């Protein structure tokens, strides 16, 4: 099927992306190894990431968002791991203030 063959990409994909950005041998010899090596190298180099539109960053904000959801790795190196778990978070605390506002309201004026 078409949606079975999606999620296998994507977690193979994630699953190389986990690999290559600790990976410490060149000699390395996983077939995805190199080519995501060089995105998660080329990441850290990388100032402008996706505010800058870089297309790189932009591709690989997306996997990591896929990957960060279930991401238990407290110092993670998956380049917007972080960053993805950081914005969650956030969205966290903006829900608990909509809930005080609503109980705020009921009490207002
Ligand atoms: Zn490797
Ligand atoms: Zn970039
Ligand atoms: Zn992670």
């Known amino acids: 099927s078409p949606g079975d063959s999606r999620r296998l990409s994507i ?3 994630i699953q190389s992306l986990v690999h290559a ?6 000699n390395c ?3 995805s190894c190199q080519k995501m090596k060089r995105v998660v190298q080329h990441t850290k180099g990388c100032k402008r990431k996706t505010n800058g539109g ?3 960053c932009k591709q690989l ?3 990591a968002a ?3 959801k279930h ?4 110092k993670c190196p998956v380049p917007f791991c972080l960053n993805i778990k950081q914005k969650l978070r956030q969205q966290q605390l903006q ?3 909509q809930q005080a506002q609503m109980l705020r309201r009921r009490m207002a004026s």
């Open 66 to 68: 896929y990957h960060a």
């Open 54 to 56: 870089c297309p790189i």
């Open 21 to 26: 950005a600790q990976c410490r041998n060149a």
């Open 95 to 97: 829900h608990r203030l």
């Open 11 to 13: 977690q193979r994909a």
């Open 61 to 63: 904000i997306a996997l």
């Open 29 to 31: 010899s996983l077939p």
């Open 71 to 74: 991401c238990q790795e407290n």
